[PDB]
């Protein structure tokens, strides 16, 4: 509805799933797409391709706003964190800056116990 022009692309990359959320500079969400909601469950959901297809659907959900330039924010260490940016760029946007905001504790809360698989 309301033109915004310059916005942010948050990329929550987990080992399981990828969540692209395109916001404005003030951090109000416009549109979002997930690898899990893009016709990909299980193995296929945790792949750079499904995180590519997700990025596309998110670009194809905020054209009504007419975003021309994006600041990208990648989070977490999954396959999503690389190819999602390639997709946004190849979807037509102009990448102003790329920042990693992955939350690192300065030795904080005890992680969960190691999986014996």
């Amino acid at each position: 509805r309301k033109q915004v022009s310059d916005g942010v692309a948050h990329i929550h990359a987990s080992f399981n799933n990828t969540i692209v959320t395109i916001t404005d500079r003030q951090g109000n969400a416009l549109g979002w797409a997930t690898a899990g909601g893009s016709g990909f469950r299980g193995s296929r959901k945790s792949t750079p391709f499904a995180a590519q297809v997700a990025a596309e659907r998110c670009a194809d959900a905020v054209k009504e706003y007419g975003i021309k330039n994006l600041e990208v924010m990648v989070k977490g260490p999954g396959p999503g964190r690389e190819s999602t940016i390639r997709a946004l760029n190849a979807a037509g946007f102009r990448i102003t800056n790329i920042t990693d905001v992955t939350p690192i504790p300065h030795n904080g809360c005890r992680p969960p116990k190691k999986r014996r698989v």
Binding site: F40, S43, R44, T47, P48, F49, A50
Partner: protein, 153 residues
């Protein structure tokens, strides 16, 4: 095999149209080393396809092949622990082999009376994009689109 010494066997071009591609087709159609029987069945079926097209027998075959030829197939290969079904681009030689083999398999499970007719029918249904041949190309294309996510490079 384990070595990798396969000198592509020397294949004669067929007598009538002079085409190694069609000579191959005959070989794939042939049963019990009865090539004479096979060649007759192919020429008959290409003669029939010549009439119901208005084109050269080789050109009418090419058009048929093209709508059968797959571009990417599924091959099961291990990456870590799990055994995923992965799309692989098919080599141009294996593009024709599959095609020719698919057509003959397709044209061996119809109701029509003579194989020559069954072949002509399927080679025609191929040209249009209808036959069981050009139904299993789709299948081997779309199953190679579901697993598109596993195409790691």
């Amino acid at each position: 095999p384990r070595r990798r010494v396969i000198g592509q066997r020397k294949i004669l071009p067929d007598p009538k149209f002079g085409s190694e591609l069609l000579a191959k087709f005959v070989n794939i159609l042939m049963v019990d080393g009865k090539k004479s029987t096979a060649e007759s069945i192919v020429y008959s079926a290409l003669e029939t396809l010549a009439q119901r097209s208005g084109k050269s027998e080789l050109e009418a075959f090419e058009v048929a092949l093209e709508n059968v030829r797959p571009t990417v197939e599924v091959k099961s290969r291990r990456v870590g622990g799990s055994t995923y079904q992965v799309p692989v681009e098919v080599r141009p030689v294996r593009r024709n082999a599959l095609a020719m083999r698919w057509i003959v398999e397709a044209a061996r499970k119809r109701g029509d009376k003579s194989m020559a007719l069954r072949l002509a029918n399927e080679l025609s249904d191929a040209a249009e994009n209808k036959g069981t041949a050009v139904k299993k190309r789709e299948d081997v294309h779309r199953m190679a689109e579901a697993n598109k996510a596993f195409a790691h490079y």
